[PDB]
């Protein structure tokens, strides 16, 4: 048996008071006048009564939405403090307008002001009411601000500084307060949405709230642009410069993927991309394919035409964005094809020559190599060093170009210090020619791997290539766990087996290591142990490497068990864990896979619009009126968006049902009294 | 004192969240309309 | 329902105390053997009433501590009473959410330290939440 | 310019008629009285008018649900044909009650009858109104029926014979028509649910509709007994015998998994399972495990006690279902451990004897072998040959027991045909002793593999083991494609390579086949080719098997390409395809994994309740009142169920919005005319 | 580590399948055990360059079946010195059937359920991690154990 009693007592309501709030929804007022007039002397009923649920006399009238009782109570001097917020929160326009024409317990935090609460509800009509009067909302401080009051307020009382800043940004991100009372609604949504994204990392505790607010700003910018009704309106929005396609460059700069990938914006971009061919969409796939090598095969002819006569009609083709892309791809493909001939044009006779002169294939490689190096700094100079590292494909260029430069440096260095011919069998293991041939081969892989970046143009391999790299970043997170599991077992295996290292002389065919025909010394050194464990993932390490010359097969059994336990952890467990999450991470990416590809393709297209870098790498070496026009288009767009968004809201709940009941209850009472 | 304040805010917040339709609710509107219809008809 | 529950609490009202998880007294074993499907049903009905957030926010000395003990005790019942595991687990999550929602209403840093540093007789209350595996209570951003 | 015009013309409604339908929802009757009285002479208005949607005048009156204009129209002789079905479809009890007390276009198929439509709506109140009057529903024919009229009707007109049967079963499967007007609602749901499931295969076109109807009956039976409020009621339902736990056995026969797996039925079953231990649930896992081998270790003592004194208190322990399960498991586990000792208890001196006598371990295996064979016919006899073949585990018993019988037959046969001892190296390939040992080893695997069937008792390994085999059927269904892809490539590879077969003498160590140290003749014969392609899945086939002694490395290249293409298809494509569908089929099973496990464990528990087979295989060889009680309980369950689902129905829609519109408009006009 | 418990539950079925096939292969091949002296380089077992006696003893049979999961056991270990080409075929079919069950059937079964089990875990990943980090944080709050291990004394 558990007795139950009210633990935290609260003052109860009297019998005469309880009938007052019970009859508030009814519609009789003679009780109010009789009590209030007598309240000056009799003090029979306290009008400012407090219901147990924390609701006062005035707040009931707002809840049932009836304004007739509201007028009567406001006639007498009642405590109306913090009652405006309740009217705004219910989004009842009639109640608010009456209110401006005028510790305790409250349902709202002390930092809430009526303008902030109105923006939270996103009610256009109510927001316009308050903004007409002189109303201000405080500026939020910067993300990294160490002033005298930001530190003082945060240190003295947190959970309020963090709440106040979130509430301010909630009001600023409301589409109604941006479409109204903002000079450039599109630009404001761009800056605010980007700012909120950066704030989701600094304030990691409130990640969900700030990220949701950022998506709210992004949708508003795209929804505003969705209301364009003519190509004249679309061109004005995209070409507007606050200081072509100036506004589209800003959208790309702020990572507004939804704004860019809008179908109306993409159609305009495709017009400029396909400038030469007006009907490329309607062409057959066979004729589209066959015509591809037509420009590609004649790439040198157009390239030389631009140099000798830029104004000529034949030279007018090259600066068309689609022609330029084909010419650059064809020029690069010539480099890769001519690399394939570098491994078969060298005679056997000069195989023993030390520091050879450039061959018949390397000589024609040289102009291309200088073209890439000369063009590498140009794109680095325009964006600066900081912008360089962000692009993953841009790191490949620097590593590939450095290897090419190192190859040329070593080839000439060996050409001047060696003159005679010596058989290749007795060359030193760090021979400069050997190093140069190794670096040249490595860079050949990187050069051929850059063709993946061209998949973005195609509509089939595009989305798959983009989603391929988006899930790559999840793989690197697993590589940290494996690199520590591998290190843990490699250290143990090396420590057990290093007592039995043997010289290469005693080995069968004078060979030491795991790359011999008969593998041996697989765990002799720490460097060799890591290689042995890596190759065991692919099953290329034989089991007999766990034996030793002296038959201490208690040590051999321990080594075999340690090797066996690594296989279970790495292959059975860890490898299967990577498959499990990669499938899960693929479901999320596939939902937005179309938006990312269009954003990625837009960046690819826009690089060929400008006149700079129009020549292939082999040939690389030898004001106020527009403001008002934008304003009138924005005014029309806001009108359509406000009208449309208002009735998507109007297209049921428990509270809605009560209001019908109140009207029926009220209508019954006035009819009965009428005679 | 702090616990009492938290309970009051929690009760009010969850009360409002509750009221935010049902077929049984449709009958109540039907009943009130019919009750009003007969009451006025008897009235003269 | 907060309003209806409060009305009955004003009158002298009692709820029978459920017995311990591992109980073997004279009446618990006898009642179970003569009539099952009623011994188990009665206990489930009682724990449903005790786990009501409105019956904890009202008529309880420490609503946070009561939700901690009741929520953990119900979790242990989901193993012994394997047949009714689904019903008992939903009651355990009801008490875990109530503790998290109650302290989500803090409006200042001063209020938060009072709750978290309270000792029954630093961070004494936080350690109790960790002991009872109140993951949602601990992981709230405040 | 596409002109649009009326194609299929329909007679329009006159102006005076159009005013009628618009005013039908209003509530004026003087127009009706004047027109209908004048219809005898003037014929001004045709009351039985059809609106554009085919709604006759009376039909709208039912549509707004009001009973006033419905009453007045009924007074005059309006065409009421097929109007009763419309009232039933709206689930309005007032219209139906008044309507009963009295080619063209219809929304209902001509075979639909008022009782048939009432059961479709599953309205308890409306159905009872029609059942009170003499009402019958036609009997459906059997699934395999070839009478004179069933074939004749189905031949002359399909799409109607099938429609009639589905309509009939929809009415019969309604819970309101089963919970009411049925002698035994639980048994009726069991028979009807099973019969509908069997109909989902013959009528494969309508599989979706019949499966849903069958699931409806299964849920009703579980819901009906979910309303039991005391343990006394539960035993009455479960122990009822239509002609212990007789009703529960019927449920298992009809595959009522939801009915069996309800926690209330499981609690009663668990009480009988743990009869010996009243507090097993509250015991610790340490004491539960430690006490397991207590009965297990002393299992021979209890078994012999039963034989010598069935009435003794000590001999009654084995009769308890849980102790009997432990005793059988301990006895079976002895066999497997006794098999462990047969591989080392023979001496190295007797490996050269032909047809040896049974060894020091095979002698005591013999009583175990006869225990299973003697017990196998006993269980098969009870259910017959047909019942035996359904269980997958039963096939394992038959194969394992047959192999043991063959092992004994060959051992005794070789024991008498040979007497001298001859070295094993000179024995024939088909020596009787060699065949006997091969069969003994094969059956050893089957004996040990049967321990997986014991996982059903455990609560952790139970659900996983059940779900382990539910999607094993999909794997076997995938093995048909592989078994034909393997045949296609095996035929191709054998055709090319069979001209280069070499004798074993020419081989290095007189070894031929892929099982030698150096693999050779991997594709010489069809039998060997299939083995080579099988072992290539696991990577155990070396690449040099594609070479031939005569260096025709164009034939070798083609043969290597056949081998390469098989690997791509089988490993990259086919193997990864099996993984993808295996997970997809796992999600569906994982939802119901608990229900199937409880049904599977219930069958395991109920096998030990009977007194048959009490002793382990090593020791196998040396009446009208209950109808009133069940009827009273069934009546109480129906009343609780009917009330419960009625309130659950009351827990909005566009059509519900209309009556509120009708009530307001009807109230508006009557008050307006009132003075 | 949250789905490592699921893996441990699958290891019971495999360990029973492994014991079943290790029983049959050792029951068949134990008549042909050869001493280490007769071996090529005085080496016995599956860890030699030439693998031999892979199924001679029960302890070695379990090791042989384990290494066959990773493909480190050669196919010629199913041969015997005396050319009984019926025992070899039966022994090779026992080895082949084990590979199908363990690799094609059981391993794909483990992948399927872990893939399903990851979805449920991924929902509560943040809450579980924050609770785990809180315990780590509160361990360093107390003054006890302030000194690092090497300076504990
Ligand atoms: C780590 N390990 C090992 O290194 N070797 C090489 C020793 C050579 O000297 C062994 O043979 C060895 C061993 N684990 C062993 O049993 C286990 C086998 C698998 C296990 N899990 N998951 C799996 C998941 C997917 C697929 C396969 C496995 C676990 Cl958990 C244990 N066995 C075999 C064994 C040998 C003797 C005995 Cl009495 C019992 C068992
Ligand atoms: C069938 N096949 C083959 O048998 N051999 C061995 C013959 C020598 O013995 C080959 O080398 C051979 C070959 N297919 C070849 O290219 C393809 C390679 C992979 C392909 N798909 N999916 C894959 C899916 C997952 C993982 C890997 C592959 C396809 Cl569709 C084609 N290559 C290589 C090649 C050789 C010469 C040239 Cl001119 C071009 C390519
Ligand atoms: C178990 N097994 C075996 O051990 N060997 C080697 C023994 C000699 O050393 C065999 O060659 C052998 C064999 N199963 C065989 O066919 C099957 C092949 C695959 C099967 N399933 N799923 C698969 C799932 C995924 C991927 C691959 C397979 C099944 Cl169910 C049966 N074949 C080939 C064979 C040989 C001769 C003949 Cl007349 C018929 C077939
Ligand atoms: Zn500041
Ligand atoms: Zn008790
Ligand atoms: Zn018939």
From Swiss-Prot, chain E:
Extracellular compartment residues: 26-93
TM ranges: 3-25, 94-114
Compartment annotation: Cell membrane
Cysteine disulfide links: 43-48
Tissue expression from the record: Expressed in brain with higher levels in fetal brain. Found in cerebellum and occipital pole.
Disease: Loss-of-function variants in TRPC5 may be involved in a mental disorder characterized by maladaptive behavior, anxiety, autism, postpartum depression, extreme food-seeking and hoarding behavior, hyperphagia and obesity.
Self-association state and partner proteins as the record states: Homotetramer. Heterotetramer with TRPC1 and/or TRPC4. Each subunit in the homomeric ion channel (via ANK repeats) interacts with one copy of GTP-bound GNAI3; the interaction is direct and activates the ion channel. Interacts with TRPC4AP. Interacts with NHERF1. Interacts with MX1 and RNF24. Interacts (via C-terminus) with CABP1. Interacts with SESTD1 (via the spectrin 1 repeat). Interacts with PLSCR1. Interacts with PKD2L2.
Entry similarity comment: Belongs to the transient receptor (TC 1.A.4) family. STrpC subfamily. TRPC5 sub-subfamily.
Task performed by this protein: Forms a receptor-activated non-selective calcium permeant cation channel. Mediates calcium-dependent phosphatidylserine externalization and apoptosis in neurons via its association with PLSCR1. Acts on distinct neuronal populations in the hypothalamus to regulate innate behaviors including feeding, anxiety (flight/fight/fear), socialization, and maternal care.
Name of the protein in question: Short transient receptor potential channel 5
């Amino acid at each position: 048996r558990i007795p139950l009693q009210i633990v935290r007592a609260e003052t109860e309501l009297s019998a005469e008071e309880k009938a007052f709030l019970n009859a508030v929804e009814k519609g009789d007022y003679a009780t109010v006048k009789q009590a209030l007039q007598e309240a000056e002397i009799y003090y029979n009923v306290n009008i400012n009564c407090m219901d147990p649920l924390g609701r006062s006399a005035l707040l009931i009238a707002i809840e049932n939405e009836n304004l007739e009782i509201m007028e009567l109570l406001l006639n007498h001097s009642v405590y109306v403090g913090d009652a405006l917020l309740y009217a705004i929160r219910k989004e009842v326009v009639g109640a608010v307008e009456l209110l401006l024409s005028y510790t305790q317990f409250s349902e709202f935090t002390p930092d809430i002001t009526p303008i902030m609460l109105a923006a939270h509800t996103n009610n256009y009509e109510i927001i316009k009411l308050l903004v007409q009067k002189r109303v201000t909302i405080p500026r939020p401080h910067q993300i990294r601000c160490n002033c005298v009051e930001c530190v003082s307020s945060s240190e003295v009382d947190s959970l309020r500084h963090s709440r106040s800043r979130l509430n301010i940004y909630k009001a600023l991100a409301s589409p109604s307060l941006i479409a109204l009372s903002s000079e450039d609604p599109i630009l404001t949504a761009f800056r605010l949405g980007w700012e909120l994204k950066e704030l989701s990392k600094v304030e990691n505790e409130f990640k969900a709230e700030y990220e949701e607010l950022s998506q709210q700003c992004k949708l508003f910018a795209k929804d505003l642009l969705d209301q364009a009704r003519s190509s004249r309106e679309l061109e004005i929005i995209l070409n507007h410069r606050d200081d072509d396609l100036a506004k589209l460059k800003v959208a790309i700069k702020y990572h507004q993927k939804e704004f860019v990938a809008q179908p109306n914006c993409q159609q305009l971009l495709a017009t400029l991309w396909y400038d030469g061919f007006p009907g490329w969409r309607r062409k057959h796939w066979v004729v589209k394919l066959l015509t591809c090598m037509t420009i590609g095969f004649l790439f040198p002819m157009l390239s030389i035409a631009y140099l000798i006569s830029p104004r000529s009609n034949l030279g007018l083709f090259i600066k068309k964005p689609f022609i330029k892309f084909i010419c650059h791809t064809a020029s690069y493909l010539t480099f890769l094809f001519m690399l394939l001939l570098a491994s078969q044009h060298i005679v056997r006779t000069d195989l023993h020559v030390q520091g050879p002169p450039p061959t018949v294939v390397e000589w024609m490689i040289l102009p291309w190599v200088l073209g890439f190096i000369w063009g590498e700094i140009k794109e680095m100079w325009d964006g600066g060093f900081t912008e360089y590292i962000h692009d993953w494909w841009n790191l490949m260029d620097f590593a590939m170009n450095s290897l090419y430069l190192a190859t040329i440096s070593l080839k000439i260095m060996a050409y001047v210090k060696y003159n005679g011919s010596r058989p290749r069998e007795e060359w030193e293991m760090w021979h400069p020619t050997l190093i140069a041939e190794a670096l040249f081969a490595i860079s050949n892989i990187l050069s051929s791997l850059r063709l993946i970046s061209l998949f973005t143009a195609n509509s089939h391999l595009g989305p798959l290539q983009i989603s391929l790299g988006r899930m790559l970043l999840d793989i690197l997170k697993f590589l940290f766990i494996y690199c520590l599991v591998l290190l843990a077992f490699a250290n143990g295996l090396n420590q057990l087996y290093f007592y039995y290292e043997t010289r290469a002389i005693d080995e069968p065919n004078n060979c030491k290591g795991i790359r011999c025909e008969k593998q041996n010394n697989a765990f002799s050194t720490l460097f060799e142990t890591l290689q042995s464990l890596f190759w065991s993932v692919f099953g290329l390490l034989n089991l007999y490497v766990t034996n030793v010359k002296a038959r201490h097969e208690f040590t051999e059994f321990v080594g075999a068990t340690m090797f066996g336990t690594y296989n279970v952890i790495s292959l059975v467990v860890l490898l299967n864990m990577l498959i499990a999450m990669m499938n899960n991470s693929y479901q999320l990416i596939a939902d937005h896979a179309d938006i990312e590809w269009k954003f990625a393709r837009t960046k690819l297209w826009m690089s060929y619009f400008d006149e700079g870098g129009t020549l292939p790498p082999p040939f690389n070496i030898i004001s106020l009126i527009q403001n008002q026009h934008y304003q009138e288009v924005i005014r029309n767009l806001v009108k359509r968006y406000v009208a449309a968004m208002i009735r998507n809201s109007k297209t049921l709940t428990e509270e809605n049902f009560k209001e019908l009941k109140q009207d029926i209850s009220s209508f019954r009472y006035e009819v009965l009294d009428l005679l």
